[PDB]
């Protein structure tokens, strides 16, 4: 009923754990926050910002229409201030 690993109960209870994780856990959180709040996430995944779905006048959708020249076609969609 037991193996080499240190019983979670002990670790989650050990003061040393929290001394570590009161730093680590919030760190990742603030990191993830900055990833979004700095608009970096938008560029990493090409996700459009609220003002970047259409052009001002245009009401059409930037649908990719061919596989091989898709990447080129996509960049062309960003051109029209989209």
């Amino acid at each position: 009923g037991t193996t080499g690993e240190r019983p979670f109960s002990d670790i989650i209870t050990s003061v040393r754990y929290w001394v570590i994780h009161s730093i680590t856990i919030p760190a990742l959180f603030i990191a993830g926050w900055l990833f979004v709040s700095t608009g970096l996430a938008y560029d990493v995944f090409g996700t459009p910002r609220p003002d970047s779905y259409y052009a001002q006048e245009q009401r059409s959708i930037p649908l990719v229409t061919d596989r091989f020249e898709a990447k080129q076609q996509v960049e062309t969609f960003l051109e029209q201030l989209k």
Binding site: A41, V44, G46, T47, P62, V64, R67
Partner: protein, 340 residues
């Protein structure tokens, strides 16, 4: 030999068993789950479906999804380093590259997982009836997420990984395939619904035919983890159902195999039906019915009623559900009943 030493290490009894299978399972399984959780929050479906599909855009747990690639892509594998994305990651995301990522990876993850079942069973020295059972969920994933779109025009018509994105996959199959009218599908639900019955009825039967092996009311503690006597009266259970239902089990070994057969057989039947929907070889109509309905304007069944619902589904959904077709349906051509 290094091999047997590598073996030794892998097959070591840890908290989370690795094993040879683990070399295939864990990488894929993690990337599959990761790819979804990634796209779910960050990646969009604008350039592929004209849809918002991430938390970053404002979608919630229900409306989020990792949408299929464009219809332009075809059945392209959409490799990160392929002709489409051309090594680019951002482009890859915007072309729905994460879908083929989740799909293909997850697929092998399901392979590794069944392999794990096989490998672990062998070691423990138990029968692999856990691996045989797991074949049904495989067939479904294979038939639905791979075989089906492979029969259609592209990956675009595969079910997108997401809650709402699956609901439309249901409504689509109704509208276009009349999927509910398919015999293979009927067997499907018959297995799942009947399987969810066996699960319920057997558990309740056992808990309420138990022997008294303790002095407390909470009889949970009063169980012997080390086999010995049967914890519940199989004989009493027999006489019970034999008098309320007329029929009853009397062979635990059959009763449990039956609990394996029913739901596994069901999912397999539902798979075959989907395999037929790939070639669009659906069970849409009854020729005898249509012929009378044409000649006779007063002939109406619940079957005729349903088809009218399908026509409505197809007409009103197709435009925004199939952007690549550039559909334009004038108000006057839209099929409508009275008032509504």
């Amino acid at each position: 030999g290094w091999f047997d030493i590598l073996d030794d290490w892998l097959k070591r009894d840890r908290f989370v068993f690795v094993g040879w299978s683990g070399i295939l399972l864990f990488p894929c399984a993690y990337l599959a789950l990761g790819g979804w959780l990634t796209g779910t929050t960050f990646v969009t479906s604008w350039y592929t479906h004209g849809l918002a599909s991430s938390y970053l855009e404002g979608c919630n747990f229900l409306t989020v999804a990792v949408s299929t690639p464009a219809n332009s892509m075809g059945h392209s594998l959409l490799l990160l380093w392929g002709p489409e994305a051309q090594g680019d990651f951002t482009r890859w995301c915007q072309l729905g590259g994460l879908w083929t990522f989740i799909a293909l990876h997850g697929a092998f993850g399901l392979i590794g997982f069944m392999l794990r079942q096989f490998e672990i069973a062998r070691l423990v020295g138990v029968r692999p009836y856990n691996a045989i059972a797991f074949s049904a969920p495989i067939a479904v994933f294979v038939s639905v997420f791979l075989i089906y779109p492979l029969g259609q025009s592209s990956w675009f018509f595969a079910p997108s990984f997401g809650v709402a994105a699956i609901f439309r996959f249901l409504l689509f199959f109704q509208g276009f395939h009349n999927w509910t009218l398919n015999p293979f599908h009927m067997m499907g639900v018959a297995g799942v619904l009947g399987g969810a019955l066996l699960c319920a009825i057997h558990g309740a039967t056992v808990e309420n035919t138990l022997f008294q092996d303790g002095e407390g009311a909470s009889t949970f503690r009063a169980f012997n983890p080390t086999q010995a006597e049967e914890t519940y009266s199989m004989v009493t259970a027999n006489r019970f159902w034999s008098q309320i239902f007329g029929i009853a089990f009397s062979n635990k070994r059959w009763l449990h195999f039956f609990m394996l057969f029913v739901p596994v057989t069901g999912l397999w039947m539902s798979a075959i039906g989907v395999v037929g929907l790939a070639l669009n070889l659906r069970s849409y109509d009854f020729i005898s019915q249509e012929i009378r309905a044409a000649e006779d304007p007063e002939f109406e069944t619940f079957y005729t009623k349903n088809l009218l619902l399908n026509e409505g589904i197809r007409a009103w959904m197709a435009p925004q559900d199939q952007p690549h077709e550039n559909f334009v349906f004038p108000e006057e051509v839209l099929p409508r009943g009275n008032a509504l």
